Amino acid sequence: QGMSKIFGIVNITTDSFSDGGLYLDTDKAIEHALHLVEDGADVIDLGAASSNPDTTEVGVVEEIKRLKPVIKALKEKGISISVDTFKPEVQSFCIAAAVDFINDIQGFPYPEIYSGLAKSDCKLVLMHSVQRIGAATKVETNPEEVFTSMMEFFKERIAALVEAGVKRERIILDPGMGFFLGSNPETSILVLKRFPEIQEAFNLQVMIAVSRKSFLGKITGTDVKSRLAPTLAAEMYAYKKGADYLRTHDVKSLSDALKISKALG
Amino acid sequence: GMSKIFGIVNITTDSFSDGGLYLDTDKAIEHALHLVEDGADVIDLGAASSNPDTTEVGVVEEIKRLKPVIKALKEKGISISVDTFKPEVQSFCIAAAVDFINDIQGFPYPEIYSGLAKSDCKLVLMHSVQRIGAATKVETNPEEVFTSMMEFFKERIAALVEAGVKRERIILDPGMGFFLGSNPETSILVLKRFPEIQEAFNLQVMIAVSRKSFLGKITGTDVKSRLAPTLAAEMYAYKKGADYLRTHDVKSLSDALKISKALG
Ligand SMILES: [Cl-]
Ligand SMILES: [Cl-]
Ligand SMILES: [Cl-]
């Protein structure tokens, strides 16, 4: 039967800095990516910057300098690559490298780039985000408001992309999780138990990305270093309900959870 | 619809004569307290010997190590289950009034059945494919292993309720992993059809799946020290209605059920 596809999270910056040698070493993140494929990652999700860009350097030229050797090495081994980036100039390079996915926390709001996205066979994952880059953190207090607004934001953005020429069945909808729904945990749970409505309402694939998000920690009172168990609980829940894609760090713990669950059924 | 966790606490001591028995039972208590804070409804006490074989001297030492931990725990008001198969040790448990007696041999000695009746301890009646006092041959094929233990419960329950034990005290553990043969399907079969135990006997079922090797057959990873493949199976049993879950990693369990309840 069906089975959620696993996006293996590989952040070049943290993987290159874990030694403490203050080295921008893509080699450490290439090997980490290869490990995730061995653990059973269907797609590798690349990240050359952080998603909350409070950080001092958001450079477009360096964000490409980091994805450059990793995409080269992974593409030669046949690895399905997904790059997570909000900068249109960085996504333009992703189109030029013919990566398999492009992950936009901003959901492609720059129509300058639409015509090129259409021509390329890149699958787009279209994330809804309640927050704005650079602005203060929003605590969206009304979960049902965030859910209906999320549905409106999709209905408009999908039609905008499809008018520009993007084939619609190459769009994946990520409703966002945790930070992207407001620091309110309950709205995170709401989206989790309501994402099948998104599939039915649009006949599109849906990606659920709950791994290690702080809302899990608030339900269990657990620290970030010990979120594996509440993570696996959530990823399993999304799987049984029909998630098309699951984004996670511990690909292998997730593979074990899915392998055990499919065998029991 | 909530499953109760059994926390596994092992009391270990070397082969030299005491002096410092306290700083081994004291950690077992510290371990059991930490397990309660991690969400353990019942502590499952284990006091197996160095050479796990019955002897008249090994019993008095197994009791010697169970005594201070049992006493310290139900001083704190914690529910106690004792994992032991030696009748003299079980008898001390009956007098200790522990909340559960977990016998891997399935109470195969009708000489003790009288004393089990004169108590309120719950009896975790456990099944095993290689059980004591059976004239039946061991079974190879899973669906036969299933119907075999289904009849084992039927008869072993009748022997207990006759002797004077109330059937409401008998929790059924069908056993898992090596206890059903080196055949992974057996434990898979039982893992999904164990609701058939509950309805056909009108009784609670314990599922003890944590860190069993058959999970490694399904997965291809190191289940003996890894969290996920165990937790994946424990969650399955929870949704299928398991009344009790025996587990080492209580914290991982407890939090995985907190998530599954918020998503209820
Ligand atoms: Cl709508
Ligand atoms: Cl392994
Ligand atoms: Cl490992």
Residue numbers in the entry:
A (entry chain A): -1 to 263
B (entry chain C): 0 to 263
Published text:
The sulfonamides (sulfas) are the oldest class of antibacterial drugs and inhibit the bacterial dihydropteroate synthase (DHPS, encoded by folP), through chemical mimicry of its co-substrate p-aminobenzoic acid (pABA). Resistance to sulfa drugs is mediated either by mutations in folP or acquisition of sul genes, which code for sulfa-insensitive, divergent DHPS enzymes. DHPS catalyzes the condensation of para-aminobenzoic acid (pABA) and 6-hydroxymethyl-7,8-dihydropterin pyrophosphate (DHPP), producing 7,8-dihydropteroic acid (7,8-DHP); this compound is further transformed, ultimately leading to tetrahydrofolate, an essential precursor for DNA and RNA synthesis. All three Sul enzymes adopted the (ɑ/β)8 TIM barrel fold also shared by DHPS.
